Specification:
This is part of a larger assembly, with chains A (122 residues), B (173 residues), C (215 residues) and D (37 residues).
Chain A lengths: L6 E4 L5 E9 L13 E9 L10 E7 L5 E2 L5 E2 L5 E4 L25 H6 L5
Parallel strand pairs in A: 1-7
Antiparallel strand pairs in A: 1-2, 2-3, 3-4, 4-7, 5-6
Chain B lengths: L14 E4 L3 E5 L5 E4 L5 E4 L4 E4 L5 H22 L2 E8 L4 E4 L4 E4 L6 E3 L5 E5 L4 E6 L2 H12 L11 E4 L10
Antiparallel strand pairs in B: 1-2, 2-3, 4-5, 6-11, 6-12, 7-8, 8-9, 10-11
Chain C lengths: L3 E12 L5 E8 L3 E7 L8 E5 L18 H9 L8 E4 L12 E2 L9 E7 L4 E3 L1 H4 L37 E3 L3 E13 L4 E5 L9 E6 L3
Antiparallel strand pairs in C: 1-2, 1-12, 2-11, 3-4, 3-6, 4-5, 7-10, 7-12, 8-9, 10-11
Classes of the chains: A mainly beta (122), B alpha+beta (173), C mainly beta (215), D mainly beta (37).
Chain C binds three RNA strands through helix 1 and strand 10.
Pfam families (chain D): Ribosomal_L36
Keywords (chain D): Metal-binding, Ribonucleoprotein, Ribosomal protein, Zinc
Organism (chain D): Staphylococcus schweitzeri
Chain lengths: 122, 173, 215, 37
RNA sequence: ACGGGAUAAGUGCUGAAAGCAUCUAAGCAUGAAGCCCCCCUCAAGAUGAGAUUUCCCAACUUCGGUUAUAAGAUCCCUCAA
RNA sequence: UUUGGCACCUCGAUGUCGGCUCAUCGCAUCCUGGGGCUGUAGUCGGUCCCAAGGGUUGGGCUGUUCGCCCAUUAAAGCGGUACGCGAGCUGGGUUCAGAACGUCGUGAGACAGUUCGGUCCCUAUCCGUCGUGGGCGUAGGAAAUUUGAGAGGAGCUGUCC
RNA sequence: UUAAGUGGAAAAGGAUGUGGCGUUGCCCAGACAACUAGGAUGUUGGCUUAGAAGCAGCCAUCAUUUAAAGAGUGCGUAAU
């Protein structure tokens, strides 16, 4: 349940560490995003070196939220922190590695490259 | 009105049954039932329907020519009928018969169906040229316009359903 | 076609095909009978009339609604029925497929039927404009003395009055509401219950009317 | 269709009629097709 | 995101006046989230007084009217969906 | 919908700008365009009909109606409605007593040029404006079981496969 | 003798309005008829202008075929 102004840790190696969300893409008035949605965000904390630099305006996909999803069989999955992954506007990542587990519903938005690179999809 | 003064209007082999405000006209292909008017009068001499107008007003001078052309059209369509012809200019633009109805394929996701009506007969000559035959001029004109309004002619290539003698302003864009 | 009356019992859930979870309202539709046919030649509209839950026979000097009065007894005497607690009329059925006195049974609905469900909603009492309508509150700090009131209610010297239908506080609650396009999940002939996917209006043990959906 | 308070024949084949209480002009080219309003 | 009617701008067909042509004057078609018909309350307060089970009779009694006596309601009492 | 006139009430008082909350008389319309015609290839442009049927965003920046960028979205009027709404709310603006700077003034002081500080009342009645009851009715006694005229009200929009 | 709800709201241009006389001037060799039957020509002759032979724009703007027709009324036209 990610809205404007929240901070998400970045779960890849593109050089960002922290990101602040600016908009939730979608419709007019869409307030909150969750696992699988694409946000546009600023980098507030970068890693020295690295492709993406501080002050950049990127878009990301949300993997991992703290208030996670309900699935169709009435089971749920929650995580312990909100994380994201910076993407390349063709749903490819900008980094090359993904750290941490990642929800299964990323396959429904065709983020196959993210789902492959991750240590186990949950 | 020279039209209302062309009020000979001779049936060839057709009966003309006045019934007051309404006329029946029966020939080879009869059953033409029209309520014409009240202001105009008419008469049958021997084999000649004459229509008279009263009072020489403007409105009567309209309705003279109208009722005359209506009657002439009725008995002439009872005798010989009317036929309207149109043609398909397109690539893969084809139509054919489906019993009594017509089926066209003009580049949609679906073929268009034209359900035939009474007193109306289609004929697909070379799967590009269609003729409609009927006994009333209004019916063939209306159903010609209805089938040609499915695909009007194009400005650039002229593709569509056009009439047989219809000029199309071909533009070069 | 196909209506029936029930008491809403409560809500549970059921696991469907390939393990999909389905939330479910169980509705007990026990002992319906056709009390009357109304016709276009006697009443001017075709309908049937169903009573639902049977109550006790008329008893001299009884105070409550547990016992029928004489008119209710005489009405349920024309069909060979006991007096019933609730009676409603159904207009969507075909009146020729029914017989006065016959039982309307739960298995007239099959699983997969899409239904409309009518009930009277819960009931909440005098509520204000934040809960009753969707109105938004004033600031809760910065000196505000405006928290849960409605705003202005009109303009000024033009229209020196308040327009009808203005969304003020008042009594919130029990109106009749139907939901459309719910569906039957399973029908249980032995317990005489229907399972409806979804939730239906009204409190527990309150009357519901099920009809076959139109759209 | 040009809709203007001053309808005038432009080409010599444009002609002026009245349909449904309005003044129109009809040429054979559809650029000279006008209506008073 | 009903699907029916009637329609706007428009497209037509037939068709004269205006002895031709022309969507129009008479006719006939078509034509839009707009206009009118399948959710909800009142709904004889629609002070003009809509439609579908029981009960009804005095002892007199200008059967008015009095006690009555009659049909179902209430007061009161235990409550809550 | 900035000026002219006033003076045509109000010096026995008609509360001033923004903002919030709530609308809506209700109209030359941004979106959908719903449709359509062309000095309309799709994409545009332009016009017509239709519409206020329905929709018509969150932030950074001010002193205020003025603006300006960021990021979205199918899209970001018209104001009479007392520049709609303070007996519904705020008091940032302006302006009351303090104080200071520039400037003008011999001076007391002024400007409106800046600047920091600064009290906004009311139990709702003749009345007009949402919800919920008692009775004048009531025409067989009376009582338990349903009209559908409309007084009617609810308008509900749209994007990607 | 009228026909906007003018009644019960004037306006600049644009079309066809009740007509109407004061008109004025057009034809049984047949009034506007429409009908459709003739469409020309040495002759673009000339400067011939992107040729253009109704049409860069200046005519040089002459006999016709026929009861009748233009160095072609004109529709046009890259020209036909």
């Amino acid at each position: 349940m990610i809205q404007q102004e929240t901070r998400l840790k970045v779960a890849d190696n593109s050089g960002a560490r922290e990101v602040l969300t600016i908009k939730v893409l979608g419709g007019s008035g869409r307030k909150t995003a969750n696992i699988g949605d694409v946000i546009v965000c600023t980098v507030k904390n970068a890693t020295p070196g690295g492709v993406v630099k501080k002050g950049d305006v990127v878009k990301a996909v949300i993997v991992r939220t703290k208030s996670g999803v309900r699935r169709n069989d009435g089971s749920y999955i929650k995580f312990d922190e909100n994380a994201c992954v910076i993407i390349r506007d063709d749903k490819g990542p900008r980094g090359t590695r993904i750290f941490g587990p990642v929800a299964r519903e990323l396959r429904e938005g065709n983020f196959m490259k993210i789902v492959s690179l991750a240590p186990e999809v949950l | 009105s020279r039209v209302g003064k062309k009020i000979i209007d001779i049936p060839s082999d057709v009966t003309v049954t006045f019934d007051g405000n309404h006329v029946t006209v029966k020939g080879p292909k009869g059953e033409l039932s029209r309520t014409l008017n009240e202001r105009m009068t008419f008469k049958q001499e021997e084999n000649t329907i004459e229509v008279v107008r009263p009072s020489d007003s403007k409105e009567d001078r309209t309705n003279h020519g109208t009722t005359r052309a209506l009657l002439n059209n009725m008995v002439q369509g009872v005798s010989q009928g009317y036929v309207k012809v149109l043609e398909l200019v397109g690539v893969g633009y084809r139509a054919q018969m489906q019993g009594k109805d017509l089926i066209l394929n003009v580049g949609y996701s679906h073929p268009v169906e034209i359900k035939a009506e009474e007193n109306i007969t289609f004929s697909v000559e070379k799967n590009t040229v269609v003729k409609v035959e009927g006994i009333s001029k209004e019916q063939v004109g209306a159903l010609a316009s209805n089938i040609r309004s499915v695909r009007p002619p194009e400005p650039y290539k002229g593709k569509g359903i056009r009439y047989q003698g219809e000029y199309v302003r071909r533009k070069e864009g | 076609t196909k209506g029936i009356l029930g008491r809403k019992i409560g809500m549970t859930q059921v696991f469907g095909e390939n393990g999909e979870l389905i939330p479910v309202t169980v509705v007990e539709a026990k002992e319906n009978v056709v009390l009357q046919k109304k016709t276009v030649e006697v009443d001017g509209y075709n309908a049937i009339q169903v009573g639902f839950e049977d109550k006790k026979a008329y008893k001299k000097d009884a105070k409550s609604n547990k016992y029928a009065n004489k008119p209710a007894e005489g009405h349920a005497k024309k069909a060979d029925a006991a007096p019933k607690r609730f009676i409603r009329e159904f207009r969507n059925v075909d009146v020729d497929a029914y017989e006065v006195g016959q039982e309307v049974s739960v298995d007239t609905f099959v699983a997969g039927d899409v239904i409309d469900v009518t009930g009277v909603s819960k009931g909440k009492g005098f509520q204000g404009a934040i809960k009753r309508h969707g109105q938004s509150r004033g600031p809760m700090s910065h000196g505000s003395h405006f928290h849960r009131a409605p705003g202005s209610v009109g303009m000024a010297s033009d229209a020196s009055r308040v327009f009808k239908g203005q969304k003020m506080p008042g009594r919130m609650g029990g109106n009749t509401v139907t939901v459309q396009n719910l569906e039957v999940v399973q029908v249980d002939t032995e317990n005489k219950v229907i399972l409806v996917k979804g939730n239906v209006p009204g409190p527990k043990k309150g009357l519901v009317e099920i009809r076959t959906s139109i759209k | 269709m040009k809709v203007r308070p001053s309808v005038k024949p432009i080409c010599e084949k444009c002609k002026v009629i009245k349909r449904k209480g309005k003044v129109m002009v009809i040429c054979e080219n559809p650029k000279h097709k006008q209506r008073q309003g």
